[PDB]
Amino acid sequence: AIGIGTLIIFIAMVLVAAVAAAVLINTSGFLQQKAMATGKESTEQVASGLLCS
């Protein structure tokens, strides 16, 4: 009798951990973009310019 239930709730544990992992993976992806963008943009700003002759 006991055995049956153990299996069922095990399934839930798996899925819930999976769902949480998805958040972390996805979010890391979302940030990767902006992180790079910010650095490149900021460098081009400080480095570039024109000079009156």
Added chain:
Amino acid sequence: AIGIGTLIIFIAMVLVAAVAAAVLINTSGFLQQKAMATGKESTEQVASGLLCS
């Protein structure tokens, strides 16, 4: 079971990094003002004067 908690503490990590960033951004702002002011003022002082004829 484990999944649930991971999500919650993730939220905190975000907010704490945000709060710290705010300090750095703000502070940079606060300094920007005085930095410029000091330079302009100091130049006007050294350059200006009157001369007896």
